[PDB]
Amino acid sequence: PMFIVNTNVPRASVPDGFLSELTQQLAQATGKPPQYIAVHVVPDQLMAFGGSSEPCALCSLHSIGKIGGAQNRSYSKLLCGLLAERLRISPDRVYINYYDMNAANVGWNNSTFA
Amino acid sequence: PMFIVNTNVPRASVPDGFLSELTQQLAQATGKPPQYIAVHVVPDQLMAFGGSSEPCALCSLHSIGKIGGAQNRSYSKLLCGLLAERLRISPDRVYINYYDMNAANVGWNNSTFA
Amino acid sequence: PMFIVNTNVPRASVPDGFLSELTQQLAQATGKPPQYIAVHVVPDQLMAFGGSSEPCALCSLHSIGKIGGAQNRSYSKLLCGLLAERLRISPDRVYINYYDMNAANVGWNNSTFA
Ligand SMILES: *c1cc(-c2ccccc2)ncn1
Ligand SMILES: *c1cc(-c2ccccc2)ncn1
Ligand SMILES: *c1cc(-c2ccccc2)ncn1
């Protein structure tokens, strides 16, 4: 899976080991090996949520399968928990786009996963 | 509605009030309360459009419904209008990718909108 | 095509003519005029791939119109090739999401391509 978070929370407020915590948690939740999980955190963004510049996050999780209603609710609880606990972002100021990628539509190591 | 603009225009050239103006205008255009709207502007990017590093923008608009031919033409007029007026980017150097999101595939406040 | 690369490689490691090279290579590869091609490179990112902060890249390629397994494999070879040669990123640490956009879902010049 690939998880991306953009946030107006400053770089200094992202704790040491945050990317490794995301990776571990996503491995558990998706059932995919940690070795293939990609994570990307973008602090200091110029963003607003509901017209407010209070802390917020705009996120995406791309996965080949493992995407659907119940699974997505679970990822949201996990991911909002993490952002709240670690970045001090209110869960109601977090949007996460979930994408079910087709294996043919993903490149890696000079080809696709088709 | 979530609107993201990535641009080579420098941060100093993004006028005060820009994220609020985006929010307000998108609220007006989508028929959604401003409380739901997320906006994100990323200046100072290393980008080229059509072989040139003149001001340009690559944007996305994600919405749960309210995406379609005529609606998208209307958004494009509005958003290119604002980018030109406020960031001095030529409309023919703006791409906006429109995404119709399923409520099940959007996380928020520990759950989804499903 | 629109090609976006996010990487933990420092900006100083991105060669001077890298945007122009991506543009040219994508034009030559897709048989498409370079005037429509957009390229965006985002260095210095806080990211991890398999829990590791060794050089990696998360990329997307958007086209209007299908890219089959054949085209996608061919793009991946080209693009990972360039990333390895120019940014010294191992191809097994590159992900590329491919998106087939509908013309009506792409805004440009105050309207859409529909
Ligand atoms: C998790 C995610 C992926 C992947 C690769 C590229 C684009 C989206 C998702 N692959 C394996 N594991
Ligand atoms: C507008 C946009 C959204 C949203 C949330 C998550 C991901 C994409 C878009 N929700 C409500 N209103
Ligand atoms: C390559 C890519 C595109 C394009 C334009 C707008 C949005 C996505 C892709 N057009 C021509 N050539």
Resolution of the structure in the document, Å? 1.8
Distance A31 CA to ligand 2 centre (A): 26
What is the Cα–Cα distance from C39 to C42, expressed in whole angstroms? 10
How many CB atoms are located within 10 Å of the residue B102 CB?
15
Residue C107 identity (one-letter amino acid):
G
B97 is in an annotated binding site: yes
Q: List Cβ<8 Å contacts ≥24 apart for A18-26.
A: A18/A86, A18/A87, A19/C46, A19/C47, A19/C48, A19/C51, A19/C53, A20/C48, A20/C51, A21/A82, A21/A86, A22/A82, A23/C48, A23/C50, A23/C51, A24/C51, A25/A78, A25/A82, A26/A1, A26/A61
Q: Which one of A4, A25, A63, A109 would you pick to mutate in the ligand 1 pocket, going by the greatest count of ligand atoms within 8 A of its CB?
A: A63
How is the beta sheet containing A2-7 ordered, strand by strand?
B111-112, B106-108, A94-100, A57-63, A2-7, A38-42, C46-49
Do B99 and B60 touch, CB atoms closer than 8 A?
A: yes
Residue C109: partners with Cβ closer than 8 Å, 6 or more residues away: B76, B80, B91, B92, B94
Nearest to C96 among A11, A35, A107 (CB): A107
Do B90 and B55 touch, CB atoms closer than 8 A?
A: yes
**Fold (topology level) of A1-114:** Macrophage Migration Inhibitory Factor (3.30.429)
Q: Please name the residue ranges forming H helices in chain B.
A: 18-30, 69-87
Backbone dihedral angles phi then psi of residue C13, each to the nearest 5 degrees = -90, -10
Q: What share of chain C is helix, strand, coil (3-state, %, to 5)?
A: 40, 30, 30
Which residue from C52, C49, C57 is spatially nearest to C8, judged by alpha carbons?
Answer: C57
* Whole-Å CA distances, B32 to B2, B7, B26, B65, C99: 11, 26, 8, 11, 27
CA distance B92 to chain A (A): 24
Instruction: Return the ∠ at Cα B86 (arms to B84 and B90), rounded to 5°.
Output: 15
| Cα-based torsion angle of the residue sequence A29, A63, A46, C61 in order, rounded to the nearest 10 degrees | 160
Q: Which one of B37, B63, B66 would you pick to mutate in the ligand 2 pocket, going by the greatest count of ligand atoms within 8 A of its CB?
A: B63
Q: Domain coordinates of chain C in residue numbers?
A: 1-114
The catalytic position among B1, B10, B33, B55 is: B1
Which residue from C8, C105, C102 is spatially nearest to C58, judged by alpha carbons?
Answer: C8
